[PDB]
Design a protein around this nucleic acid. Sequence first.
DNA 1: CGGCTTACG
DNA 2: CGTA
DNA 3: GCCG
Length: 329
Amino acid sequence: MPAYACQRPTPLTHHNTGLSEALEILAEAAGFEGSEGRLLTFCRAASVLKALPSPVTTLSQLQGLPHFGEHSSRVVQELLEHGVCEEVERVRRSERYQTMKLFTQIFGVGVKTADRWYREGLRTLDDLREQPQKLTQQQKAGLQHHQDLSTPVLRSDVDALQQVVEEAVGQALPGATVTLTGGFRRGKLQGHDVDFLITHPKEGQEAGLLPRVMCRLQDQGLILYHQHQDAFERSFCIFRLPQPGSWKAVRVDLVVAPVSQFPFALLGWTGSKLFARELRRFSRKEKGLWLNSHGLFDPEQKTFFQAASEEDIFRHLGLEYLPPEQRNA
DNA sequence: CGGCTTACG
DNA sequence: CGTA
DNA sequence: GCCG
Ligand SMILES: Nc1nc2c(ncn2[C@H]2C[C@H](O)[C@@H](COP(=O)(O)NP(=O)(O)OP(=O)(O)O)O2)c(=O)[nH]1
Ligand SMILES: [Mg+2]
Ligand SMILES: [Mg+2]
Ligand SMILES: [Mg+2]
């Protein structure tokens, strides 16, 4: 079992679901307290279990596994012996964890903002609604749409959304393409949003595209919120999506990349977020190359690797290729 | 011990 | 600060 | 919290 998540296949569904879910609670709680190192270790340990070929049934099976030390092994031991880990349960029911989870789930609210509100005594969404002077326009939109945004997006929703985005993209720039990325590209059957990557086969033609796309979507009445309701290339918006007799708000992410960068953007925005983070860490620490969603840089030669495909990038990094369905770290 | 992310909005 |  |  290699130490980096990008060195092993991680399928969407696996054989250690309960154990990984417990470790991810602790990871989440570490992030609520600002402990990014502990968050990473618990995230990485959970990911190791997702990559295992069978269930962990005894402690000895944790021997030699990367990112399992005293703390994560004790968590697994208690789940194996009693079905529950007291630390995890204490976190689950704590007022701090529940409120930080509630607040950070709001679109436009991160850990710093949620922590400030918590310290001021706020605890519920209605607490926030009563203090609208505390809220950015983005957070007001996240708060008003919170109930719809907490409803999982379904794979059936995704196809209708992609068609309306493609229609607006095609008017904005004939020949531009829309590629589904994020969790649905990794095979997820539901998600918190829908992620699209847009490009054009003629390098440079994608410049200035996303303002034109957003203006067309907004004119069609499909945009409930976006940051530009000047030049921009990413939009994190809220879409109006049809439903039986009505509609629901859905988060949609749109990203534009030139075709030269498209493989790097596709790799970055397909995720998972831990997979991509580990891939960039592997690139820097093990290969001495700087990877991001725009390219792959050799700091010694001061040169960028050209890539025509994700397969190119895995090869540049000396990694076996993983299809998106195996990037569910 | 140092290290653990990234550009863009 | 937020996207996260 | 764990790795190197
Ligand atoms: N660097 C970084 N990139 C991130 C982060 N979160 C997301 N991204 C970028 C990089 C990710 O690869 C990309 C897509 O992640 P989502 O759409 O946020 N989530 P997914 O589709 O996996 O699932 P679902 O939507 O169902 O929750 O967004 C983060 O914390 N950090
Ligand atoms: Mg997504
Ligand atoms: Mg997204
Ligand atoms: Mg230390």
